[PDB]
Enzyme design. Structure first.
Site, mmCIF file in Angstrom:
data_model
loop_
_atom_site.group_PDB
_atom_site.id
_atom_site.type_symbol
_atom_site.label_atom_id
_atom_site.label_comp_id
_atom_site.label_asym_id
_atom_site.label_seq_id
_atom_site.Cartn_x
_atom_site.Cartn_y
_atom_site.Cartn_z
ATOM 1 N N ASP A 1 36.678 38.959 41.734
ATOM 2 C CA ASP A 1 35.491 38.586 40.965
ATOM 3 C C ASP A 1 35.703 37.577 39.836
ATOM 4 O O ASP A 1 36.137 37.949 38.748
ATOM 5 C CB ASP A 1 34.904 39.879 40.390
ATOM 6 C CG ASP A 1 33.509 39.702 39.833
ATOM 7 O OD1 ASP A 1 33.032 38.552 39.726
ATOM 8 O OD2 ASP A 1 32.896 40.730 39.500
ATOM 9 N N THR A 2 35.372 36.312 40.083
ATOM 10 C CA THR A 2 35.539 35.276 39.068
ATOM 11 C C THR A 2 34.585 35.457 37.891
ATOM 12 O O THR A 2 34.777 34.861 36.828
ATOM 13 C CB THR A 2 35.314 33.877 39.659
ATOM 14 O OG1 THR A 2 33.997 33.805 40.215
ATOM 15 C CG2 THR A 2 36.342 33.589 40.741
ATOM 16 N N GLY A 3 33.560 36.279 38.079
ATOM 17 C CA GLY A 3 32.603 36.509 37.015
ATOM 18 C C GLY A 3 33.020 37.606 36.052
ATOM 19 O O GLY A 3 32.374 37.813 35.028
#
Ligand SMILES: O=C(N[C@H]1c2ccccc2C[C@H]1O)[C@H](OCc1cc(F)ccc1F)[C@H](O)[C@@H](O)[C@@H](OCc1cc(F)ccc1F)C(=O)N[C@H]1c2ccccc2C[C@H]1O
Lengths: 99, 99
Positions: free
Chosen positions: B25-27
């Protein structure tokens, strides 16, 4: 381009004739933007993440430009703390995760 | 490897001798896993997501294997809906976004 993750992957997007800042989020199934006005009819939806669920308005067939790339898809609008570009649009610009 | 986003970017991780599935998850700024037992003392932390905040336990210098790559860093444990591998560990394995 190639984006490193030392900092949050924020980019500039163009929607409804407006320039906004948004996060490229691979953990988000859909795209959700802070309260704003969009054309067409909408449908209510509930999305959940860390902390629980929030009610958003669902708009379909919305055109968005991500870093100069045109993409079309569903866009949700609601009380999100930050603008989020999710998988439904990341796929359209050919974004991949690499390591 | 190169991972597309037509489906959730789930991978297998190994922690505490156990295999688990987690989302790249880059967020997510940090890494948070579902309730489990980890060694050592923990410190308190609050993380906010799309639906509000949740309290989690912070453990430091934890060994975790992601897709075969060994990483050692901070891991949060709490009532998260899914196991999340955040930017703090994504950078350790050399993960980048490309398009
Ligand atoms: O709720 C999620 N997806 C949902 C979603 C989002 C938009 C539209 C639809 C859907 C549904 C579902 O996919 C995602 O979480 C995993 C997740 C995945 C899933 F697959 C189902 C349930 C889940 F919880 C979520 O988009 C995260 O990618 C991220 O959200 C954007 C964001 C970024 C910031 F920088 C600051 C605030 C903020 F809010 C976020 O909450 N980041 C925070 C975080 C996370 C872990 C540790 C620390 C911190 C602090 C922040 O970085």
């Amino acid at each position: 381009p190639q984006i490193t993750l030392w900092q949050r992957p924020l980019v500039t997007i163009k929607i409804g004739g407006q320039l906004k800042e948004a996060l490229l989020d691979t953990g988000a199934d859909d795209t959700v933007l802070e309260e704003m006005s969009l054309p067409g009819r909408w449908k209510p939806k509930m999305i959940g993440g860390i902390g629980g669920f929030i009610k958003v308005r669902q708009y379909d067939q919305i055109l968005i430009e991500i870093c100069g790339h045109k993409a079309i898809g569903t866009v949700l609008v609601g009380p999100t703390p930050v603008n989020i570009i999710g998988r439904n649009l990341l796929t359209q610009i050919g974004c991949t995760l690499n390591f």
